[PDB]
Amino acid sequence: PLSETKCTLKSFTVEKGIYQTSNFRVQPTESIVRFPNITNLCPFGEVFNATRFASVYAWNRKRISNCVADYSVLYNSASFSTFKCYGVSPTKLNDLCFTNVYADSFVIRGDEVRQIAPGQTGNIADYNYKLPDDFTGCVIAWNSNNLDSKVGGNYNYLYRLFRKSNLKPFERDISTEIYQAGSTPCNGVKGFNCYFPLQSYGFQPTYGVGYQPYRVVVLSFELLHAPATVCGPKKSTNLVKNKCVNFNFNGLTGTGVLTESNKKFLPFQQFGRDIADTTDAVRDPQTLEILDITPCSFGGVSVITPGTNTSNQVAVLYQGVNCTEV
Amino acid sequence: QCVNFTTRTQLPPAYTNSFTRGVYYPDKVFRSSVLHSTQDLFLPFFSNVTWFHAIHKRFANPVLPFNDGVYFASTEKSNIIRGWIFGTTLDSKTQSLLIVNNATNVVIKVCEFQFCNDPFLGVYYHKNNKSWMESEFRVYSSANNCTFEYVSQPFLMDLEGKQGNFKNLREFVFKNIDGYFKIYSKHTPINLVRGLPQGFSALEPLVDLPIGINITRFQTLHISSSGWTAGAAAYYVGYLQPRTFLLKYNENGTITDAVDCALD
Amino acid sequence: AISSVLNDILSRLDPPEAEVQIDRLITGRLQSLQTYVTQQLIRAAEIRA
Amino acid sequence: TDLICAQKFNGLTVLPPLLTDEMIAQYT
Numbered sequence: 001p002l003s004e005t006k007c008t009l010k011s012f013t014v015e016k017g018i019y020q021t022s023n024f025r026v027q028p029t030e031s032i033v034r035f036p037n038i039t040n041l042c043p044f045g046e047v048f049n050a051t052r053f054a055s056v057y058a059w060n061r062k063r064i065s066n067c068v069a070d071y072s073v074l075y076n077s078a079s080f081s082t083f084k085c086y087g088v089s090p091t092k093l094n095d096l097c098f099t100n101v102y103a104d105s106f107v108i109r110g111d112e113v114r115q116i117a118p119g120q121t122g123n124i125a126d127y128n129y130k131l132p133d134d135f136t137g138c139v140i141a142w143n144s145n146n147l148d149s150k151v152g153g154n155y156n157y158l159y160r161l162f163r164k165s166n167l168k169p170f171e172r173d174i175s176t177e178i179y180q181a182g183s184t185p186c187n188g189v190k191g192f193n194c195y196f197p198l199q200s201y202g203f204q205p206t207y208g209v210g211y212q213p214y215r216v217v218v219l220s221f222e223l224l225h226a227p228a229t230v231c232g233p234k235k236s237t238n239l240v241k242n243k244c245v246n247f248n249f250n251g252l253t254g255t256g257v258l259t260e261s262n263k264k265f266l267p268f269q270q271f272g273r274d275i276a277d278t279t280d281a282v283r284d285p286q287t288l289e290i291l292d293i294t295p296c297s298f299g300g301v302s303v304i305t306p307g308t309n310t311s312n313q314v315a316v317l318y319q320g321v322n323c324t325e326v
Numbered sequence: 327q328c329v330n331f332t333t334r335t336q337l338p339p340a341y342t343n344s345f346t347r348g349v350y351y352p353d354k355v356f357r358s359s360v361l362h363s364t365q366d367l368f369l370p371f372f373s374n375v376t377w378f379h380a381i382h383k384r385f386a387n388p389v390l391p392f393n394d395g396v397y398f399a400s401t402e403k404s405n406i407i408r409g410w411i412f413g414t415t416l417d418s419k420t421q422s423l424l425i426v427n428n429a430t431n432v433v434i435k436v437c438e439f440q441f442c443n444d445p446f447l448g449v450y451y452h453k454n455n456k457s458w459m460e461s462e463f464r465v466y467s468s469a470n471n472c473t474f475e476y477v478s479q480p481f482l483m484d485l486e487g488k489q490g491n492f493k494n495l496r497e498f499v500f501k502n503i504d505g506y507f508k509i510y511s512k513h514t515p516i517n518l519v520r521g522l523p524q525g526f527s528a529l530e531p532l533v534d535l536p537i538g539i540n541i542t543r544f545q546t547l548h549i550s551s552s553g554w555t556a557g558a559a560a561y562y563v564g565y566l567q568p569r570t571f572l573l574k575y576n577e578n579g580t581i582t583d584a585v586d587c588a589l590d
Numbered sequence: 591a592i593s594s595v596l597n598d599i600l601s602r603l604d605p606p607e608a609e610v611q612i613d614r615l616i617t618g619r620l621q622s623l624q625t626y627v628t629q630q631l632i633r634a635a636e637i638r639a
Numbered sequence: 640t641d642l643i644c645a646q647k648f649n650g651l652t653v654l655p656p657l658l659t660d661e662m663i664a665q666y667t
Binding site: 100168169170171225226263264265266268269270271272273274275280281 | 351353354355356357360504505530531534536538540578579
């Protein structure tokens with residue numbers, strides 16, 4: 001600590017006085033995260049063996065909630081033509097918990113691959129299906145040109161190119177009839193500078209990549225302030241209070257000492273906040289408990305030493321904290 | 327079922343002012359001894375809510391838009407209102423939503439509903455051992471393609487009919503957040519004949535419905551085949567707007583005051 | 591930026607991509623902290639006077 | 640004329656004064 005002041009003052013002679021050098025902080029010893037039991041596992045690999053998928057606006061959904069999803073059967077490694085992923089890989093979803101999961105399957109074009117993205121616009125994004133901002137998964141795609149493609153175009157599948165307005169996330173339109181396309185309603189039957197909203201795939205196996213079918217499977221993810229029902233492959237790492245730990249509670253990740261308080265919360269209020277809009281007190285999603293968030297102790301380091309020509313004795317001072325280690 | 331009542335007549339839309347009504351808990355965050363401000367869809371203060379009533383030969387059940395959000399204020403004695411219906415076309419062409427109050431639990435189901443022109447529930451034989459129990463279900467004949475089902479927690483409700491001024495009061499707020507419905511419920515005794523009393527109350531959440539259906543209109547499936555009559559009931563429908571509340575929180579977390587400025 | 595939470599960006603975007611969102615959070619917080627220090631130096635001159 | 644401890648959690652450190660309140664009245 002005598003040399004800590006030498007590098008702070010950038011000199012080999014330390015004059016008498018008090019000088020600040022570093023900042024001490026208590027690191028978390030363990031990780032306390034608590035969520036209840038797992039319900040079921042999502043069909044990540046069961047939708048890859050389907051014979052034919054739905055269209056862009058027709059996407060079929062199988063509802064299996066409570067991530068962790070199925071990590072066992074994974075076809076996503078080097079088995080397909082193109083891999084475009086966002087967020088984290090599905091192998092890493094075992095460390096995260098999501099509320100609801102909707103497995104969707106649809107076929108798009110070459111120029112429509114770049115339009116796939118959470119919270120982004122596009123022809124199929126706004127007018128057909130939009131990815132929510134809560135989706136951390138990978139977008140799986142493969143080239144179906146050897147199957148779904150037909151001579152002169154395949155009109156079996158359909159898609160909607162135009163709509164009177166953009167669709168919000170998690171919204172569907174199954175209507176195949178003639179409705180308003182642009183901003184000026186033409187009152188039913190096509191004409192008056194409007195366009196027929198429904199469209200058909202023109203897939204020709206002999207043209208470029210933009211005109212060829214690509215089977216895309218996306219599992220819709222949802223993340224809210226609702227309490228999570230699952231934690232990891234392992235759950236509790238049983239709580240021991242009055243210690244510095246790293247906690248994730250109801251989706252709020254932080255580091256601090258967990259203590260019990262007298263705070264009275266409403267049954268439907270999951271967690272509160274302080275005047276700083278930061279985590280203050282939270283409730284146990286698994287069982288009935290009330291925990292208060294106390295961040296771990298930290299402060300500045302003060303060095304009290306006499307002159308270099310006087311003595312080498314050094315007194316270390318911690319500001320506004322109690323030392324339990326020493 | 328498909329035949330409207332012979333006593334059904336559209337009533338004049340009278341108006342009245344709601345002093346503090348329209349305030350609720352914006353979120354689940356708890357605070358104490360501080361003043362928080364947030365902007366959500368709210369009911370403005372001192373607004374004009376449409377005044378409705380029901381007697382034994384005048385009954386009206388108009389349809390109002392759900393687009394900007396609505397505020398439900400219902401004062402009752404025997405708790406006439408059994409719920410509401412949500413739907414766009416109000417037919418089997420698309421999905422619909424119902425809320426049924428049996429004075430035991432809450433029945434919430436999303437199916438394909440065949441909507442009769444004048445839906446109701448058969449109630450008869452009130453002389454010996456009335457009990458005011460539901461008997462006939464006229465709302466829909468059949469259901470199919472059910473995407474949602476829910477059962478709530480048990481509660482208690484007073485079905486006893488009384489004479490004189492109203493006693494019980496219930497204020498509901500139904501708002502859609504990005505495809506999610508949230509229900510607010512509060513019950514307090516009041517003494518009221520017509521209009522609204524001056525007071526303050528807080529609206530606690532009840533059930534959050536993760537359905538995702540878009541509802542452009544709501545019809546009236548509440549009190550009580552044209553020979554059927556109606557009783558005494560009254561309810562209100564408000565209009566929600568993206569307002570801003572400044573709320574006070576006490577040591578117990580209850581809201582003691584509400585301030586929304588656009589007035590003074 | 592996308593979000594003010596640091597763990598939300600690191601657990602979502604890529605390490606090369608997250609450097610763009612984190613840089614927007616840093617440069618925004620640099621000017622806010624610099625404004626407070628400048629305000630304290632001006633206010634301390636009135637207290638010293 | 641707690642607010643102090645609430646602000647100390649985000650990295651705002653209030654240093655105690657060298658001259659306490661008891662010694663001020665002793666100089667006066």
